[PDB]
Each structure stands twice: as structure tokens, then as C-alpha cells.
Design an enzyme around this catalytic site. Structure first.
Site, short mmCIF file in Angstrom:
data_model
loop_
_atom_site.label_atom_id
_atom_site.label_comp_id
_atom_site.label_asym_id
_atom_site.label_seq_id
_atom_site.Cartn_x
_atom_site.Cartn_y
_atom_site.Cartn_z
N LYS A 1 0.84 -1.16 0.00
CA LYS A 1 0.00 0.00 0.00
C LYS A 1 0.89 1.22 0.00
CE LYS A 1 -2.42 -3.13 1.50
NZ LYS A 1 -3.45 -4.16 1.73
N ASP B 1 -22.08 15.32 31.85
CA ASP B 1 -21.66 14.15 32.61
C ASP B 1 -21.28 14.60 33.96
OD1 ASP B 1 -21.89 12.59 30.17
OD2 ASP B 1 -19.71 12.56 29.95
N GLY C 1 -16.65 20.52 24.05
CA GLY C 1 -17.59 19.56 23.53
C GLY C 1 -18.80 19.32 24.43
N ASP C 2 -18.55 19.11 25.75
CA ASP C 2 -19.56 18.86 26.78
C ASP C 2 -19.11 19.24 28.15
OD1 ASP C 2 -17.67 17.06 26.45
OD2 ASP C 2 -18.94 15.32 26.34
ZN LIG Z 1 -17.80 14.43 29.06
ZN LIG Z 2 -15.73 16.61 28.00
#
Ligand SMILES: [Zn+2]
Ligand SMILES: [Zn+2]
Ligand code: NA
Ligand code: NA
Ligand SMILES: [Zn+2]
EC number: 2.7.7.7
Length: 327
Positions: free
Chosen positions: A64, A248, A181-182
Site C-alpha cells: 500500500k 456528565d 464539547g460537553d
Molecule cells: Zn464528558
Molecule cells: Zn468533556
DNA sequence: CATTAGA
DNA sequence: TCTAATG
């Protein structure tokens, strides 16, 4: 880092494809180590044979490597990239709760699009339902500006519930990050440590408060130490409602808070580096503790930590503000 | 590398 | 019980 770039990138594409589209953990594992070593290799690989001399690179990959060096592409890569089935799995997988396994399944049945997902919401579990529901909102980064409002809320309730609660919002956000992100909130309480046989309510009371005032709008998974939901800032005075955010929350034995906070705050690199250092300094660091090393090869005996400091002190480092925990 | 759903 | 999915 840029010398073996495409090589390692092509390899990763290949890898990732085995694993998801097909279920060849082996090849998939193949491409990975290969992609791993050619990555370290300090020289510009000029051919397959040269590569080939590497550990993990056998004849398949070598081949490859040639095609790719030779013509700026790869057939299998061109083919795959085009393949609708495979494109399809790669996509469904973006729904929070949809993994490869399920992705393949659905495809099998013929759900390849987001719309398919809708008319078939029945075939979907709770998590996946919610993921489908906030598909757009979940894909969106969180502006720090918002992070501050969120943090602001969680702190107030936590406290109103019990004043003994200690919460810290970890993540990139803790590190200065412009967006994240969160939200990750690490929580612990005094009456809850290593021994003291749990106290589920401790996590539950709080989740309960939060939902209570409408900060949490959905539960993806709630257990006795880790709650995984969706939140939202009050969509103020009309015209502008906020995007549904992922959140979370984790309960920690107070006796292993900071290690954890240390850990989650990252970055991955500051970690490893912090970790590597602890070693010379005659220790060990992990998500929950820091234990002195002993000559017999290894050793244990979890050192007592009261703040992010103590850990540093131990390994006798310089306290590095979260801001500069970048590497 | 551990915690949770689910079937 | 295992096996998936998130982190
Ligand atoms: Zn998280
Ligand atoms: Zn996070
Ligand atoms: Na070899
Ligand atoms: Na997903
Ligand atoms: Zn060289």
C-alpha cells in the site's frame, strides 16, 4: 509528524475501516501498529521496502505504501471512500448511542439515512432516541461564554442542596479552552470515600435538583456514580432558545478527588508528561491516586492528597495552573 | 479501562 | 450473563 503524514494517515483510514465496516480487528489492528511505527520513524520513507524493514510492516502494507508513494492515491481507499455502505456506517455512527455494531445492523435492514432513522424510531433505544433528537445540537461546540453560565448554575444548585458538596468542572474548559464539547462535572462529598460503602443518594439528590429547575432535560444514563444526560440554558426572553448540551456528572470518593480532577483536566499530554515525571520522582499516578514506588520493581500505599498541590509537591514539581496544563 | 443499558 | 457504547 509531517514526514510520515500521508502514510500514517492512509493507514489510519484503512484501519478504521476494517474495524467498523468489516469486523477485522486483526487487520484493523495491523494498520494501527504499522501506522504507529512509521509514525515514529525519523526518516522520510521513500518506498515500501524501506518501510517494510519496520516492525509490523509486512508485505501487505508495504504494497500500500508503494502505490500511495507512487501515485498520490490508493485504490482500496478510492473504492471505500465511494462505497455507499461503508459511507453509511460511518455516518449513522454519529448518532450518540449508535456504534458500529448497530450501524451495520441498520444498514443491513436498510436505514442508511437520518430520515430512515426517523420513520424507524421504534428500532432505536432510549439513548439513541435522544441522540437522534439532538443530532444537530450535539454536533455543535460549546462556547465558553455559555460554559460560564452553565457552571454558574450547577454550582448554585449543588450548593443549595448540600453545602458539603464540592464540584469542579473539568475538561478543556478548566484549561482555558474557548469552546468545549460537553460539560464534565467531578463531584465528591465528605461523607463519601474509598471505604464508606457508597451513598447513591449523593449523586441522585443533585441530579434531581438540576432537573428540578430545568437544567437537565434528559437522562442518557444514570447510575450510582455516573450520570450522563442533556442540559440547557434557559432560553431567555424568546427568539433565542439554547442548544441541548451534553453533560456528565461523576461522584467521587472524596479521598481520590484531586487525582481525578488532576486527571480529567488533562491535557492528555500534560498527563502523560506529568505521569512520566512522577516515575523518576519515585511514584505512580493514576486516575485515583499516587503511590510511592519501591525498588522491588513496584510498590503501593496511596498517598494522602488535599489539593492539586500535594500531588505536584509529591513529585516535587511546579504548580501549573490549569491554563498551562497544555502539555 | 470502567461504568451502564439491554436483551 | 455478555456485549455494546461513551468517555
Ligand atoms: Zn464528558
Ligand atoms: Zn468533556
Ligand atoms: Na518487518
Ligand atoms: Na454515535
Ligand atoms: Zn533519514
Amino acid at each position: 509528524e509531517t514526514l510520515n503524514g500521508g502514510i500514517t494517515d492512509m493507514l489510519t483510514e484503512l484501519a478504521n475501516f476494517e474495524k467498523n465496516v468489516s469486523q477485522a480487528i486483526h487487520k484493523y489492528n495491523a494498520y494501527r501498529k504499522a501506522a504507529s511505527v512509521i509514525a515514529k520513524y525519523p526518516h522520510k520513507i521513500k518506498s515500501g521496502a524501506e518501510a517494510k524493514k519496520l516492525p509490523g510492516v509486512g508485505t501487505k502494507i508495504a504494497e500500500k505504501i508503494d502505490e500511495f508513494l507512487a501515485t498520490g492515491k490508493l485504490r482500496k481507499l478510492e473504492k471505500i471512500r465511494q462505497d455507499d455502505t461503508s459511507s453509511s456506517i460511518n455516518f449513522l455512527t454519529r448518532v450518540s448511542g449508535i456504534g458500529p455494531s448497530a450501524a451495520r445492523k441498520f444498514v443491513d435492514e436498510g436505514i442508511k439515512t437520518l430520515e430512515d432513522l426517523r420513520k424507524n424510531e421504534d428500532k432505536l433505544n432510549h439513548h439513541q432516541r435522544i441522540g437522534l433528537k439532538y443530532f444537530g445540537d450535539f454536533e455543535k461546540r460549546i462556547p465558553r461564554e455559555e460554559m460560564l453560565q452553565m457552571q454558574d448554575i450547577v454550582l448554585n444548585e449543588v450548593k443549595k442542596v448540600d453545602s458539603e458538596y464540592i464540584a469542579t468542572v473539568c475538561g478543556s474548559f478548566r484549561r482555558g479552552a474557548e469552546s468545549s464539547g460537553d460539560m464534565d462535572v467531578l463531584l465528591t462529598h465528605p461523607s463519601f470515600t474509598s471505604e464508606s460503602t457508597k451513598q447513591p443518594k449523593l449523586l441522585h439528590q443533585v441530579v434531581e435538583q438540576l432537573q428540578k429547575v430545568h437544567f437537565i432535560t434528559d437522562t442518557l444514563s444514570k447510575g450510582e456514580t455516573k450520570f450522563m444526560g442533556v442540559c440547557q440554558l434557559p432560553s431567555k426572553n424568546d427568539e433565542k432558545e439554547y442548544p441541548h448540551r451534553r453533560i456528565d456528572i461523576r461522584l467521587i470518593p472524596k479521598d481520590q478527588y484531586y487525582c481525578g480532577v488532576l486527571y480529567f483536566t488533562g491535557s492528555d499530554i500534560f498527563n502523560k508528561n506529568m505521569r512520566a515525571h512522577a516515575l523518576e520522582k519515585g511514584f505512580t499516578i493514576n486516575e485515583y491516586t499516587i503511590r510511592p514506588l519501591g525498588v522491588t520493581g513496584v510498590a503501593g500505599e496511596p498517598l494522602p492528597v488535599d489539593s492539586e498541590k500535594d500531588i505536584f509537591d509529591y513529585i516535587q514539581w511546579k504548580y501549573r495552573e490549569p491554563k498551562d496544563r497544555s502539555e
